[PDB]
RNA sequence: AGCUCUCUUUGCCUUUUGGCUUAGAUCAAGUGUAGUA
């Protein structure tokens, strides 16, 4: 349980991708934000990324 | 509804501040009663 | 020098500039 | 037989509930048990109908 | 007293007792354990886990009756019978099939 | 002076300001720019 | 078992129980 | 085939936004110069 606690924590702990957090909680919060919400919102961030049509 | 304004090498000094004052609050996340009970716990850590 | 700057700042700058700026007892009456 | 409980083993990863966790558990515990002391339990066996046959 | 029927509780109260070296006070919690929570299967494959860790074939054979008794799914009887192949005794095991 | 043309700067502060925020507080979004009123920063947005 | 705790609570030093 | 090492994958939520009302209610700001040496 230990190694598995240490292993989420050092997995958890690299700054891979976007940043929009501020937070350790905050991050974690929207990696779960992702986790549910790619699969909706995923043609949003699509617009988002090309500064243009929805 | 005109585009943007492109920036400059030298930028003036009220977008240092503005982009300053930006950062500081972008990162605010407590309010005067969270920050109060931090200071104590440290004052009485520090007392202990 | 009012020419467009080479490294335009964006949001996710703020956000990053955000982000980077946030025992032994002597004897058994203290323990 | 291998493949088919290996398959099973990766249809049987996601979270079902407890009872299935506690079976998958369970099954593992007795797997790293190891052979058990089939000796042993026959001293045991031998000991206790000797002194229930005392008895 | 909180939190009776935490299934958690008392499955991180009996390791407690039991990572002690406290035997028969984690067995009278194990025997608690069950009869507050009879339909829990997790606290079941516990107690005979531990009571086949510690020997005592016959004990946990008579814990294996009680579950029995309790009617459970199929996992158990299967369990049972693996518990009775391991030890040679396969008439019992005919037995528990019936 | 309150208004005038709008920089890049301007506009990124008030995409970080929308992203900590949101759209129902423009207040605090003309509090972090300096030259914009909440109405001017919302017809901008 | 309730003798063996008594005991064990008895001669407890807190020396070793700074390592984890 | 099994045991171990590292890596990957799946599962994983592991701390992963305590309430209510009139979006509770409001909310521009000092100044900022320099004929002649």
Not at chain 2, 8 to 17: N, S
Not at chain 4, 13 to 20: Q, V
Not at chain 6, 6 to 23: C, F, M, P, Q, R
């Amino acid at each position: 349980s230990l190694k598995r606690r240490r292993e989420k924590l050092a997995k958890s702990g690299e700054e891979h991708g976007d940043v929009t957090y501020i937070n350790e909680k905050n991050k974690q919060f929207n990696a779960k934000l992702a986790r549910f919400y790619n699969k909706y919102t995923a043609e949003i961030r699509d617009s988002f990324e090309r500064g243009t049509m929805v | 509804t005109k585009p943007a304004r492109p920036d400059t090498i030298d930028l003036d000094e009220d977008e240092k501040e503005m982009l300053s004052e930006a950062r500081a609050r972008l990162a605010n996340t407590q309010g005067k009663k969270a920050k109060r009970k931090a200071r104590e716990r440290q004052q009485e850590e520090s007392r202990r | 020098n009012k020419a467009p700057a080479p490294i335009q700042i964006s949001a996710e700058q703020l956000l990053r500039e955000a982000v980077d700026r946030q025992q032994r007892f002597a004897d058994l009456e203290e323990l | 037989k291998r493949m088919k409980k290996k398959e099973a083993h990766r249809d049987d990863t996601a979270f079902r509930d407890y009872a299935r966790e506690a079976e998958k558990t369970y099954k593992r515990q007795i797997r790293n048990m190891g052979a058990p002391d089939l000796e042993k339990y026959m001293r045991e066996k031998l000991s206790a109908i000797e002194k229930a046959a005392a008895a | 007293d909180v939190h009776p029927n935490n299934t958690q509780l008392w499955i991180r109260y009996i390791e407690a007792e039991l990572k002690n070296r406290n035997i028969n006070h984690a067995r009278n919690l194990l025997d608690r354990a069950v009869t507050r929570l009879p339909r829990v299967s997790k606290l079941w494959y516990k107690y005979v886990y531990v009571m086949e860790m510690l020997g005592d074939i016959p004990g946990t054979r008579q814990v294996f009756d009680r579950w029995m008794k309790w009617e459970p799914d199929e996992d158990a009887w299967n369990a049972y019978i693996k518990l009775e192949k391991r030890y040679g005794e396969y008439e019992r095991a005919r037995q528990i099939f019936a | 002076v309150k208004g005038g043309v709008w920089t890049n700067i301007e506009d990124e502060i008030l995409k970080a300001a929308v992203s900590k925020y949101g759209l129902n507080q423009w207040a605090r979004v003309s509090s972090l720019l300096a030259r914009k009123t909440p109405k001017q920063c919302k017809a901008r947005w | 078992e309730i003798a063996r705790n008594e005991w064990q609570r008895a001669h407890f030093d807190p020396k070793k129980q700074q390592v984890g």
